[PDB]
Structure formats: C-alpha cells, structure tokens
Design an enzyme around this catalytic site. Structure first.
Site, mmCIF file in Angstrom:
data_model
loop_
_atom_site.group_PDB
_atom_site.id
_atom_site.type_symbol
_atom_site.label_atom_id
_atom_site.label_comp_id
_atom_site.label_asym_id
_atom_site.label_seq_id
_atom_site.Cartn_x
_atom_site.Cartn_y
_atom_site.Cartn_z
ATOM 1 N N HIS A 146 71.381 -52.595 -6.311
ATOM 2 C CA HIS A 146 72.744 -53.062 -6.057
ATOM 3 C C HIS A 146 73.760 -52.365 -6.967
ATOM 4 C CE1 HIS A 146 71.857 -56.019 -9.419
ATOM 5 N NE2 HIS A 146 70.711 -56.043 -8.764
ATOM 6 N N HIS A 181 81.061 -51.285 -10.513
ATOM 7 C CA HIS A 181 81.279 -51.638 -9.120
ATOM 8 C C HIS A 181 82.268 -50.618 -8.546
ATOM 9 C CE1 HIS A 181 79.327 -55.588 -9.847
ATOM 10 N NE2 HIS A 181 79.896 -55.429 -11.028
ATOM 11 N N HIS A 185 77.278 -51.504 -16.397
ATOM 12 C CA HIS A 185 77.198 -51.032 -15.025
ATOM 13 C C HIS A 185 78.602 -50.999 -14.408
ATOM 14 C CE1 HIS A 185 77.200 -55.437 -14.756
ATOM 15 N NE2 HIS A 185 77.922 -55.243 -13.673
ATOM 16 N N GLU A 227 86.441 -55.498 -8.898
ATOM 17 C CA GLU A 227 86.192 -56.918 -8.654
ATOM 18 C C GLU A 227 87.405 -57.759 -9.032
ATOM 19 O OE1 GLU A 227 82.177 -57.864 -10.229
ATOM 20 O OE2 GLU A 227 81.654 -57.356 -8.157
ATOM 21 N N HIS A 269 81.635 -52.953 -16.341
ATOM 22 C CA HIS A 269 81.278 -54.206 -16.988
ATOM 23 C C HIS A 269 80.322 -53.959 -18.150
ATOM 24 C CE1 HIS A 269 82.356 -56.608 -13.163
ATOM 25 N NE2 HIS A 269 83.396 -56.368 -13.950
ATOM 26 N N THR A 314 78.989 -62.055 -11.515
ATOM 27 C CA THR A 314 79.568 -61.771 -10.203
ATOM 28 C C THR A 314 78.488 -61.372 -9.193
ATOM 29 O OG1 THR A 314 80.133 -59.433 -10.631
ATOM 30 C CG2 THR A 314 81.788 -61.042 -11.206
ATOM 31 N N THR A 315 77.213 -61.444 -9.564
ATOM 32 C CA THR A 315 76.073 -61.238 -8.663
ATOM 33 C C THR A 315 75.142 -62.443 -8.795
ATOM 34 O OG1 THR A 315 74.985 -59.873 -10.390
ATOM 35 C CG2 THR A 315 76.009 -58.710 -8.587
#
Ligand code: ZN
EC number: 4.2.1.1
Length: 257
Positions: A61, A93, A91, A103, A116, A195-196
C-alpha cells in the site's frame, strides 16, 4: 491490520473497522482562518543526527523506510508533546496526478504528496503497546509540491526499482532524514488517528506549514511502483491516500501567530 497487505478503497474500511466513523479520525482539512495560535506550545525539537536507517519495504500500500528504534537515536520532543517519541519509519502518500495525493488539505487545497514520519512514545515500551494509547504516537506530516528536485530525496527514488512489487525489501542504511525537512518548523497540531487500517485513535498530529519541493521526475518514479505481488496482474501504486474526515469536536492549534 498493519503490515504487508493490499487495501481496498477507503470508503469500504468502515465495514471491517467500525472506528473508521469515530470521533477523532484523520486526515482532516486545515482551515487556516479557524486555527488558533497557542502561545502555550513549547518549541519543537527534532533530533535526527544519530538516526539509523535499516531497510526499505514495499508493503502493498506504500513503501516504508524503517529505522533502528531499539534506542533513542532519532527522536521528536517539545511542541504539544510530553515525553520522548522515537522514529520507527517514514512513508509517503501520492496521486496519479500532480493535483492530488496529500491526505491533509490546507483550506481544501490538495498537495501532490505527503510525507509521514512516524514516532512512538517511549513510555509505552514498544510500538504495539503504544498504538493502544491516546498519546501513543506522534506523526510529523510534511507536504510535497512539484517544482525543483529535492536532493535529499534522490537516494530514496534510486532504490524503488529494486522494490517494485508487494513484499520486496532492500537494504537502506546510512540515510539522513534531515534532508527531507523544510527550512521552517512552523506547524499546526490536533489529535487524530492512523490513516490506514486499523485506524486507531492514538496519534498527535504535527503538520508543517512549509512544503518541500520535489521534481516531476522524482514523483513519476513513485508512480511506477506496484500494489501487486510479482507475477500477479499489474496495478500501479497510485492514489494511496485517504480523504479528509469530519473534524467533529476538535480544535486545530497553530505554533505561529
Ligand atoms: Zn501515512
């Protein structure tokens, strides 16, 4: 539900994780004209000079750069935090297009990507115990916009070919995460969540106001990774961001007037 695994679309997560509709979910839109300056906040202290990076992993992901967290080598303190928080991984996004990918949003504006840096509160002994506490994690968020290349990012872009598919990892030692920070440490802060999956409400969010710039060619290489495992049908790793969630009963505070 953390670790290597593909996720389905965020709009389906509530069926397996009811906390996805909770009272302190992340990310959120940052209304800059409603956030209040807080002169009580103490200055933020980022102490990354002894950081020890170890490995980079495609987890199906995103990709995580993992750190040795068995000692206080890379830590975050001050600001809204009480205590010492240890860096465990960072990581990103990102989007299928430069106009989307972050995000958090700022006055409804979306950036091309969001970094993040995840840290856990050492008074809880390890990451697994920390996520079960309201003050267990502190995540530093940094926006990315497309413009000039970021020198400190290129060693990351360089190794992505070797971790193209889900479950692959590569050695990633001696990486200095200070090269990913902007000049100013002015920030917004609020209480929130992962957020996951599993979306636990254990995070103090610290989102920097100043974005960093990366080049179009650097973000294009993020978009070449795969969500799938090797030998499976190819799915480009793009648009792995969760949309803004209701602010509910929360206030965003600012570190700057
Ligand atoms: Zn994240």
């Amino acid at each position: 539900h953390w670790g290597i695994g593909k996720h389905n679309g965020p709009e389906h997560w509530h069926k397996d994780f009811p906390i996805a509709k909770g009272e302190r979910q992340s990310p959120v839109d940052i209304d800059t004209h409603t956030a209040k300056y807080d002169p009580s906040l103490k200055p933020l202290s980022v102490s990354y000079d002894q950081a020890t990076s170890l490995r980079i992993l495609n987890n199906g992901h995103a990709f995580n750069v993992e750190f040795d967290d068995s000692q206080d080598k890379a830590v975050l303190k001050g600001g809204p935090l009480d205590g010492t928080y240890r860096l465990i991984q960072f990581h990103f996004h990102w989007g299928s297009l430069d106009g989307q990918g972050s995000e958090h949003t700022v006055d409804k504006k979306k950036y091309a990507a969001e970094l993040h840096l995840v840290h856990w509160n050492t008074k809880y002994g390890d990451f697994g115990k920390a996520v079960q506490q309201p003050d267990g994690l502190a995540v530093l968020g940094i926006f990315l916009k497309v413009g000039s290349a970021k020198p400190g990012l290129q060693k990351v872009v360089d190794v992505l070919d070797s971790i193209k598919t889900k479950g692959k990892s590569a050695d990633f030692t001696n990486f200095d995460p200070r090269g990913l920070l902007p000049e100013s440490l002015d920030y917004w802060t609020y209480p929130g969540s992962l957020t996951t999956p599993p979306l636990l409400e254990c995070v103090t969010w610290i989102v920097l106001k100043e974005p960093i710039s990366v080049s179009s060619e650097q973000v294009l290489k993020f978009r070449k990774l795969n969500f799938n495992g090797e030998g499976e049908p190819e799915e480009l790793m793009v648009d792995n961001w969760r949309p803004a969630q209701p602010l509910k009963n929360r206030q965003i505070k600012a570190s700057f007037k």
